[PDB]
Amino acid sequence: SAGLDDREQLASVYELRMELEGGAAALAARRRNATDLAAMAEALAALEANLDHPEQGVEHDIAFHVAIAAATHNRYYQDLLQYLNLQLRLAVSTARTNSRRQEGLTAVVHQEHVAVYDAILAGDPDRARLAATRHLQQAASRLRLDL
């Protein structure tokens, strides 16, 4: 429920997400179908509304990354992200609460999410992996985690 002296624990979640979600983005770039695109795009639209009404932004952020995991068409990726759901909520909600005290930083975060969608849409697995890990490295650096 907080994060002052919990940085090393946050760093452990983000560092694991970097290997899982980079791999999921690259798989999704190869296997996504029209139904997957709609799931990611609907999450991205709901995330555009939270730029002004920030309630449930954590659920929609998570739903976006879960939609990428579903787009791999690999049941074990999906089950791993559901198994780690509590850690995702901890990391996401900590990162978003921190982000909303600055700028349109929330809008810079929204762009990082869109960049992963865009590379998955193009079917470019290397670009998708790099965009997914950059989102996590930038979220960690915004939290001063030092991975």
Ligand X SMILES: O=C(O)CC[C@@H](O)C(=O)O
Site of interaction with a copy of itself (CB under 8 A): 12-13, 15-16, 18-20, 22-24, 27, 72, 74-77, 80, 83-84, 87
Give the closest residue to 65 by CA, choosing from 113, 133, 130, 128.
113
Apex CA 36: angle with CA 55 and CA 62, to 5°? Answer: 30
Contact between residue 25 and residue 68 where contact means Cβ atoms under 8 Å apart = yes
Residue 95 contact among a copy of itself, ligand X, Cl ion, none, beta carbon within 5 to 8 Å by kind = ligand X
* CB 5, min distance to Cl ion, A: 28
Task: Specify the residue, 46 or 74, whose C-beta has the smaller distance to Cl ion.
Answer: 46
Maximum pairwise Cα distance, the chain: 43
Asked if residue 21 binds Zn ion (CB under 5 A), the reply is no
Q: SS3 sequence, 1-41?
A: CCCCCCHHHHHHHHHHHHHHHHHHHHHHHHHCCHHHHHHHH
Which of 25, 26, 47, 81 is in the footprint of Cl ion by CB under 5 A?
A: 47
36/61 with CB nearer Zn ion: 61
Interacting residue ranges for ligand X, rule: CB under 6 A? 61, 65, 83-84, 86-87, 91-92, 95-96, 99, 109, 139, 142
Binding annotation: 61, 65, 113, 135
